[PDB]
Structure 1
Amino acid sequence: ARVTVQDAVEKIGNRFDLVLVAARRARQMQVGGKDPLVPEENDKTTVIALREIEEGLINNQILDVRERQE
């Protein structure tokens, strides 16, 4: 359950890198290759990804780092 994304835009600026980063993270989570980090609590991949971004465990830099590790 989520309401707003104000903390998300505070964490990731431009409110557009937020959408793209959340989209890519949700895409990895959705196709059955990867697994989530924040404990899922009945939400969907989109809101879970936004939860991750808002809490501060993922961004474009961290996403690219985890990608280049693989």
Structure 2
Amino acid sequence: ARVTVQDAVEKIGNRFDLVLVAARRARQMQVGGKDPLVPEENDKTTVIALREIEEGLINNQILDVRERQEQQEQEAAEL
């Protein structure tokens, strides 16, 4: 779990952009078929989001390129 978010704010250079990126990733994990990149230790999707931010596994650029990738793969099914 998280008691202070200071490690995530050092990777994402703001608190407001941190809130936005973590809300986007937590909405991916909560309503959506996406799976966490860290072991879910009985945490809610907000804390799993912040723990993925803290480890450097997720930021706005990674989220954007992953969206581009899954959208291009879903559009690749031209049949």
Q: Tell me if TM exceeds 0.5.
A: yes
Q: TM-score, normalised by structure 2?
A: 0.82
Q: What is the aligned-residue RMSD (CA, Å)?
A: 0.8
Measure the CA separation in 2 of the matches of 1:13 and 1:7. Answer: 10
Greater RCO structure (CA 8 Å; 6+ sep): 1
Structure with the greater alpha carbon radius of gyration: 2
Structure 2 unmatched ranges of 5 or more = 69-79
Q: Flag as ranges the 4+ runs of structure 1 deviating above 2 A.
A: none
1:5-47 CA-to-partner distances (Å, cap 9, x unmatched) read: 1111111012111000000000010014211110101110000
Alignment of 1:54 with 2:34, yes or no, is no
Q: TM-score, normalised by structure 1?
A: 0.92
Report % sequence identity. 100
